[PDB]
A paper describes a structure:
Here, we explore and test these notions using resurrected Precambrian β-lactamases11 as scaffolds for the engineering of completely new active sites. Of these systems, resurrected Precambrian β-lactamases have been thoroughly characterized in terms of their structure, function and stability. These putative ancestral proteins have been shown to be highly stable and able to efficiently degrade several antibiotics. A hydrophobic-to-ionizable amino acid replacement generates a buried (or partially buried) residue with the perturbed properties that are useful in catalysis and conformational flexibility assists the generation of a completely new active site by facilitating substrate and transition-state binding.
As is custormary in the field, these alternative sequences were derived from a random weighted sampling of the posterior probability distribution. This can again ultimately be viewed as a reflection of flexibility at the GNCA node, as mutations removed from the active site can easily shift the conformational equilibria at this node. Clearly, the specific mutations present in the GNCA4 scaffold have led to the population of a conformation in the W229D variant with a cavity where the substrate can easily form a reactive conformation, and with better architecture for effective transition-state stabilization. Remarkably, however, the new active site behaves differently and engineered β-lactamases encoded by several alternative reconstructions at the GNCA node (common ancestor of Gram-negative bacteria) display Kemp elimination activities that span a ∼30-fold range. The several GNCA sequences studied differ among themselves at 8–20 positions, which are, in essentially all cases, distal from the neighbourhood of the Kemp elimination active site.
Author numbering: 27 to 58, 60 to 238, 240 to 252, 254 to 291
Write the structure that this text describes.
Amino acid sequence: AALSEQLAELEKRSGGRLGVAVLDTATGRRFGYRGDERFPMCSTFKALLAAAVLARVDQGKENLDRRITYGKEDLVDYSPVTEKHVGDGMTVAELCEAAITYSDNTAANLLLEALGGPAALTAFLRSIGDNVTRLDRWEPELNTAAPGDPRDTTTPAAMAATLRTLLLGDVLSPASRQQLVDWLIANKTGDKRLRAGLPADWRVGDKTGTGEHGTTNDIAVIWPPNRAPILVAVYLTESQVDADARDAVIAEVARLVVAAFH
């Protein structure tokens, strides 16, 4: 495979450690570059958080319209949505949207408490067959991204398989499935990452993550026109180029991936 070689060249220039997984649902195969190495999730976990929330909505243990109230004491850094709604609160559905489409940290923390904390999300993931991904801390502590730390990590391959299970398998209702898809499709944080290397006709839902030690991630479900989706997980950490160049690394991965498909 020349794809593996291109990603190794790209990884060299980034100065860090690059992980890539592609899962093609039309076939069932999957590609990996460091796909079984641990990487810090940063905000990419928030997709899995909204999935677990939706499961309890499926179970009748939670409601999409339930309004959660909170105060300024609950607000953590980078909370561009929740910081506007302390006076009126926000519904669980609104928090999910904020968490996914803006990486709102306070929304994630509030959703994490309504679920039962990091251990709860981690237990949900084991219940759906993901034995690798783990969430250990809250926002913003889970973004430390220390090079040898297993807390708050996934692997590209595990994240890809989890996305597959959640977005197209049988763990969520079809309604909860479509809702999670629509949130990812409306993400506002990823325009410089995977989206920027994809052909414009391709429909795309994604969740980004950003953290210390030059960490820049993006995970996605992508539908080529008339064709089964693929799942793509990209994690970059310990990188030594600036933010704009780390974004460019992710975009080029998206390009190197689609070219590999033609």
